[PDB]
Amino acid sequence: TVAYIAIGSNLASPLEQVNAALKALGDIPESHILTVSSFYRTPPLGPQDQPDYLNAAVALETSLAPEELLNHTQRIELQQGRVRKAERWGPRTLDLDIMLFGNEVINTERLTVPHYDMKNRGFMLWPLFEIAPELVFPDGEMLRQILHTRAFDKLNKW
Numbered sequence: 001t002v003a004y005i006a007i008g009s010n011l012a013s014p015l016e017q018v019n020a021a022l023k024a025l026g027d028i029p030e031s032h033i034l035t036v037s038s039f040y041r042t043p044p045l046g047p048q049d050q051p052d053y054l055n056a057a058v059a060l061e062t063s064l065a066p067e068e069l070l071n072h073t074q075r076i077e078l079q080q081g082r083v084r085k086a087e088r089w090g091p092r093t094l095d096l097d098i099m100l101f102g103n104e105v106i107n108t109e110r111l112t113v114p115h116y117d118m119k120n121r122g123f124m125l126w127p128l129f130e131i132a133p134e135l136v137f138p139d140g141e142m143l144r145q146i147l148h149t150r151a152f153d154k155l156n157k158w
């Protein structure tokens with residue numbers, strides 16, 4: 001199963017955080033990175049008080065069940081997610097989202113695949129389009145089509 005995972009960090013200095021994440025993704029049991037998108041600097045979706053995000057996409061080969069993979073992604077967000085300031089630990093600044101898990105459709109308490117809002121999110125679609133441009137969604141929609149129809153702005157590389 002090729003799972004596609006979206007990575008986000010909004011630290012002022014997220015490069016170290018994202019790289020630590022990609023190694024942890026790589027250390028997940030029965031899983032390894034096939035491909036990594038470029039790193040992108042995106043303006044945040046939401047209050048524009050918070051810093052710019054570093055966004056990227058990752059193709060992950062895995063023999064894991066989807067919920068099992070999720071446990072792993074949430075563990076990493078717990079482990080690599082926060083980083084120390086001198087006083088205390090800071091809030092977590094790693095987001096690992098499962099955009100797709102093979103051709104599977106999933107709707108549960110814990111999991112919604114495809115990711116529920118990725119279709120309105122340029123910072124998810126473009127990096128993905130870079131590593132899987134002929135990607136077809138389980139309902140037959142094409143990633144290229146959705147980028148075509150909405151005409152999202154391209155991303156500046158980080």
Ligand SMILES: CC1(C)Nc2nc(N)[nH]c(=O)c2N=C1C(=O)NCCN(CCSC[C@H]1O[C@@H](n2cnc3c(N)ncnc32)[C@H](O)[C@@H]1O)CP(=O)(O)O
Binds near residue numbers: 007042043053097117
């Ligand atoms: C958006 C916002 C503020 N602005 C941004 N702007 C830019 N430029 N770039 C960004 O990156 C970016 N992201 C920011 C963000 O705040 N991101 C949080 C992502 N956050 C999903 C994490 S899972 C929490 C719960 O979600 C359940 N969950 C359900 N399905 C899945 C799934 N398929 N994969 C993973 N977790 C699943 C899971 O059980 C857990 O308990 C909520 P959401 O944005 O609404 O996606």
